[PDB]
Short mmCIF file of all heavy atoms in Angstrom, two decimals:
data_model
loop_
_atom_site.label_atom_id
_atom_site.label_comp_id
_atom_site.label_asym_id
_atom_site.label_seq_id
_atom_site.Cartn_x
_atom_site.Cartn_y
_atom_site.Cartn_z
N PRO A 47 -18.87 13.95 -8.22
CA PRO A 47 -17.66 14.77 -8.20
C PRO A 47 -16.95 14.81 -6.85
O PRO A 47 -15.72 14.87 -6.80
CB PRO A 47 -18.18 16.17 -8.57
CG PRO A 47 -19.38 15.91 -9.38
CD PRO A 47 -20.02 14.70 -8.77
N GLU A 48 -17.72 14.77 -5.76
CA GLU A 48 -17.16 14.76 -4.41
C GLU A 48 -16.44 13.45 -4.08
O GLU A 48 -15.43 13.45 -3.38
CB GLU A 48 -18.24 15.04 -3.36
CG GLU A 48 -18.66 16.51 -3.25
CD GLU A 48 -19.64 16.94 -4.32
OE1 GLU A 48 -20.35 16.08 -4.89
OE2 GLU A 48 -19.73 18.16 -4.59
N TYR A 49 -16.98 12.34 -4.58
CA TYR A 49 -16.40 11.02 -4.35
C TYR A 49 -15.15 10.79 -5.20
O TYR A 49 -14.19 10.17 -4.74
CB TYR A 49 -17.43 9.91 -4.61
CG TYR A 49 -17.11 8.60 -3.90
CD1 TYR A 49 -17.62 8.34 -2.62
CD2 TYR A 49 -16.31 7.63 -4.50
CE1 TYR A 49 -17.34 7.14 -1.97
CE2 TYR A 49 -16.02 6.43 -3.85
CZ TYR A 49 -16.54 6.20 -2.59
OH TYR A 49 -16.26 5.01 -1.94
N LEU A 50 -15.16 11.30 -6.43
CA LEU A 50 -14.01 11.18 -7.34
C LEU A 50 -12.80 11.97 -6.86
O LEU A 50 -11.66 11.52 -7.04
CB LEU A 50 -14.40 11.60 -8.77
CG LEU A 50 -14.73 10.50 -9.78
CD1 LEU A 50 -16.00 9.75 -9.41
CD2 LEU A 50 -14.85 11.08 -11.18
N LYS A 51 -13.04 13.13 -6.26
CA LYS A 51 -11.99 13.96 -5.66
C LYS A 51 -11.31 13.20 -4.51
O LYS A 51 -10.09 13.26 -4.35
CB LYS A 51 -12.58 15.28 -5.16
CG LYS A 51 -11.57 16.28 -4.60
CD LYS A 51 -10.86 17.06 -5.70
CE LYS A 51 -9.99 18.17 -5.13
NZ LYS A 51 -10.79 19.27 -4.51
N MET A 52 -12.12 12.49 -3.73
CA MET A 52 -11.64 11.69 -2.61
C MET A 52 -11.01 10.38 -3.09
O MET A 52 -9.94 9.99 -2.63
CB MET A 52 -12.79 11.41 -1.64
CG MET A 52 -12.41 10.60 -0.41
SD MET A 52 -13.77 10.27 0.72
CE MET A 52 -14.84 9.24 -0.30
N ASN A 53 -11.69 9.71 -4.03
CA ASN A 53 -11.25 8.43 -4.57
C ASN A 53 -11.48 8.36 -6.08
O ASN A 53 -12.60 8.09 -6.53
CB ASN A 53 -11.96 7.28 -3.85
CG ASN A 53 -11.51 5.91 -4.32
OD1 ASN A 53 -10.55 5.77 -5.08
ND2 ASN A 53 -12.21 4.87 -3.86
N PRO A 54 -10.42 8.60 -6.88
CA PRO A 54 -10.49 8.55 -8.35
C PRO A 54 -10.79 7.15 -8.90
O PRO A 54 -11.32 7.04 -10.01
CB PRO A 54 -9.09 9.01 -8.79
CG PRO A 54 -8.22 8.79 -7.61
CD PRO A 54 -9.09 9.03 -6.42
N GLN A 55 -10.45 6.11 -8.14
CA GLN A 55 -10.75 4.73 -8.53
C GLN A 55 -12.22 4.36 -8.33
O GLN A 55 -12.67 3.31 -8.78
CB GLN A 55 -9.84 3.74 -7.79
CG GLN A 55 -8.48 3.54 -8.42
CD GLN A 55 -7.69 2.42 -7.78
OE1 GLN A 55 -7.10 2.59 -6.71
NE2 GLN A 55 -7.68 1.26 -8.42
N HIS A 56 -12.95 5.25 -7.65
CA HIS A 56 -14.38 5.08 -7.34
C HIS A 56 -14.77 3.66 -6.88
O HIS A 56 -15.63 3.01 -7.48
CB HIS A 56 -15.28 5.58 -8.49
CG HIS A 56 -14.91 5.03 -9.83
ND1 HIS A 56 -15.32 3.78 -10.26
CD2 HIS A 56 -14.18 5.55 -10.84
CE1 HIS A 56 -14.85 3.56 -11.47
NE2 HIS A 56 -14.15 4.62 -11.85
N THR A 57 -14.13 3.21 -5.81
CA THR A 57 -14.38 1.88 -5.26
C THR A 57 -14.76 1.94 -3.78
O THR A 57 -14.61 2.98 -3.13
CB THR A 57 -13.15 0.95 -5.41
OG1 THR A 57 -11.98 1.63 -4.95
CG2 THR A 57 -12.96 0.53 -6.87
N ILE A 58 -15.27 0.83 -3.27
CA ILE A 58 -15.53 0.67 -1.84
C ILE A 58 -14.71 -0.50 -1.28
O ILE A 58 -14.50 -1.49 -1.98
CB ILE A 58 -17.04 0.49 -1.52
CG1 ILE A 58 -17.67 -0.61 -2.38
CG2 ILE A 58 -17.78 1.82 -1.69
CD1 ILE A 58 -19.02 -1.08 -1.91
N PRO A 59 -14.24 -0.39 -0.02
CA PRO A 59 -14.47 0.73 0.90
C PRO A 59 -13.53 1.91 0.69
O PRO A 59 -12.48 1.77 0.05
CB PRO A 59 -14.21 0.10 2.27
CG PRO A 59 -13.19 -0.95 2.01
CD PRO A 59 -13.40 -1.44 0.59
N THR A 60 -13.93 3.07 1.21
CA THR A 60 -13.04 4.21 1.32
C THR A 60 -12.97 4.63 2.79
O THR A 60 -14.00 4.92 3.40
CB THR A 60 -13.50 5.40 0.44
OG1 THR A 60 -13.76 4.94 -0.89
CG2 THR A 60 -12.42 6.48 0.39
N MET A 61 -11.76 4.62 3.33
CA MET A 61 -11.54 5.01 4.72
C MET A 61 -11.24 6.51 4.81
O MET A 61 -10.36 7.02 4.11
CB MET A 61 -10.39 4.20 5.33
CG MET A 61 -10.22 4.39 6.83
SD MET A 61 -8.54 4.14 7.44
CE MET A 61 -7.71 5.59 6.79
N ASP A 62 -11.98 7.19 5.67
CA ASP A 62 -11.74 8.59 5.98
C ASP A 62 -11.41 8.72 7.47
O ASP A 62 -12.30 8.70 8.32
CB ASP A 62 -12.95 9.45 5.60
CG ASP A 62 -12.71 10.95 5.80
OD1 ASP A 62 -11.57 11.35 6.14
OD2 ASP A 62 -13.66 11.73 5.61
N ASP A 63 -10.11 8.82 7.76
CA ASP A 63 -9.64 9.04 9.12
C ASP A 63 -9.15 10.47 9.28
O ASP A 63 -7.95 10.75 9.15
CB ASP A 63 -8.55 8.02 9.49
CG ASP A 63 -8.06 8.17 10.93
OD1 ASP A 63 -8.81 8.70 11.79
OD2 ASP A 63 -6.92 7.75 11.21
N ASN A 64 -10.09 11.37 9.54
CA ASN A 64 -9.81 12.78 9.81
C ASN A 64 -8.98 13.47 8.71
O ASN A 64 -7.95 14.08 8.98
CB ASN A 64 -9.15 12.94 11.18
CG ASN A 64 -9.23 14.35 11.71
OD1 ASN A 64 -8.21 14.96 12.04
ND2 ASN A 64 -10.44 14.89 11.80
N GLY A 65 -9.46 13.35 7.47
CA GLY A 65 -8.80 13.96 6.32
C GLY A 65 -7.89 13.01 5.56
O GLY A 65 -7.69 13.17 4.35
N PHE A 66 -7.35 12.02 6.27
CA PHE A 66 -6.48 11.02 5.67
C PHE A 66 -7.31 9.99 4.91
O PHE A 66 -8.01 9.16 5.51
CB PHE A 66 -5.60 10.35 6.73
CG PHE A 66 -4.67 9.30 6.19
CD1 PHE A 66 -3.66 9.63 5.30
CD2 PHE A 66 -4.82 7.97 6.58
CE1 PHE A 66 -2.80 8.65 4.80
CE2 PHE A 66 -3.97 6.98 6.08
CZ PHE A 66 -2.96 7.32 5.19
N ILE A 67 -7.22 10.05 3.58
CA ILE A 67 -8.03 9.21 2.71
C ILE A 67 -7.25 7.97 2.27
O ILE A 67 -6.10 8.06 1.85
CB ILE A 67 -8.54 9.99 1.46
CG1 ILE A 67 -9.27 11.28 1.87
CG2 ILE A 67 -9.40 9.10 0.57
CD1 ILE A 67 -10.43 11.09 2.85
N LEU A 68 -7.90 6.81 2.38
CA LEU A 68 -7.27 5.54 2.08
C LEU A 68 -8.29 4.52 1.58
O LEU A 68 -9.35 4.33 2.18
CB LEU A 68 -6.58 5.01 3.34
CG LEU A 68 -5.45 3.98 3.26
CD1 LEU A 68 -4.15 4.62 2.79
CD2 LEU A 68 -5.26 3.36 4.63
N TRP A 69 -7.98 3.89 0.45
CA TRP A 69 -8.74 2.72 -0.01
C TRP A 69 -7.80 1.53 -0.15
O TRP A 69 -6.64 1.60 0.26
CB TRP A 69 -9.55 3.03 -1.28
CG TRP A 69 -8.78 3.59 -2.44
CD1 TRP A 69 -8.33 2.91 -3.53
CD2 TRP A 69 -8.39 4.96 -2.63
NE1 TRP A 69 -7.67 3.76 -4.38
CE2 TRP A 69 -7.69 5.02 -3.86
CE3 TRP A 69 -8.55 6.13 -1.89
CZ2 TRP A 69 -7.16 6.21 -4.36
CZ3 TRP A 69 -8.02 7.32 -2.39
CH2 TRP A 69 -7.33 7.35 -3.61
N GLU A 70 -8.28 0.43 -0.74
CA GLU A 70 -7.60 -0.87 -0.68
C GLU A 70 -7.71 -1.43 0.74
O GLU A 70 -6.97 -1.02 1.64
CB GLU A 70 -6.12 -0.78 -1.12
CG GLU A 70 -5.89 -0.36 -2.57
CD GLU A 70 -6.24 -1.43 -3.59
OE1 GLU A 70 -6.32 -2.63 -3.21
OE2 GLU A 70 -6.42 -1.08 -4.77
N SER A 71 -8.64 -2.36 0.91
CA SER A 71 -9.03 -2.89 2.22
C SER A 71 -7.87 -3.35 3.10
O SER A 71 -7.86 -3.08 4.30
CB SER A 71 -10.02 -4.04 2.03
OG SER A 71 -9.46 -5.06 1.23
N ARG A 72 -6.91 -4.04 2.51
CA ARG A 72 -5.78 -4.60 3.25
C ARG A 72 -4.81 -3.54 3.76
O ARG A 72 -4.19 -3.71 4.81
CB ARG A 72 -5.05 -5.65 2.41
CG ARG A 72 -5.87 -6.92 2.20
CD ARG A 72 -5.48 -7.67 0.94
NE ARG A 72 -6.52 -8.61 0.54
CZ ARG A 72 -7.53 -8.31 -0.27
NH1 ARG A 72 -7.66 -7.09 -0.78
NH2 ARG A 72 -8.43 -9.24 -0.57
N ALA A 73 -4.69 -2.44 3.01
CA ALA A 73 -3.90 -1.29 3.45
C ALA A 73 -4.59 -0.57 4.61
O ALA A 73 -3.92 -0.04 5.50
CB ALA A 73 -3.65 -0.34 2.29
#
C-alpha cells in the first residue's frame, strides 16, 4: 500500500528526491 501510493504503476526504478516522486528512467 505504501509503494502504490508513491507509484501506482508499481515499477522500478522509483526516484524519491525529497518528496518529489518520479519514475520512468529517462525522465
Side-chain angles (χ1 to χ4, degrees):
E48 283 81 23
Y49 203 91
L50 261 66
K51 184 81 173 291
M52 181 180 65
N53 182 9
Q55 276 188 281
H56 51 81
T57 49
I58 51 166
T60 310
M61 189 208 71
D62 185 5
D63 182 24
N64 198 235
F66 179 65
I67 306 305
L68 201 75
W69 54 100
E70 297 287 341
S71 58
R72 290 155 198 90

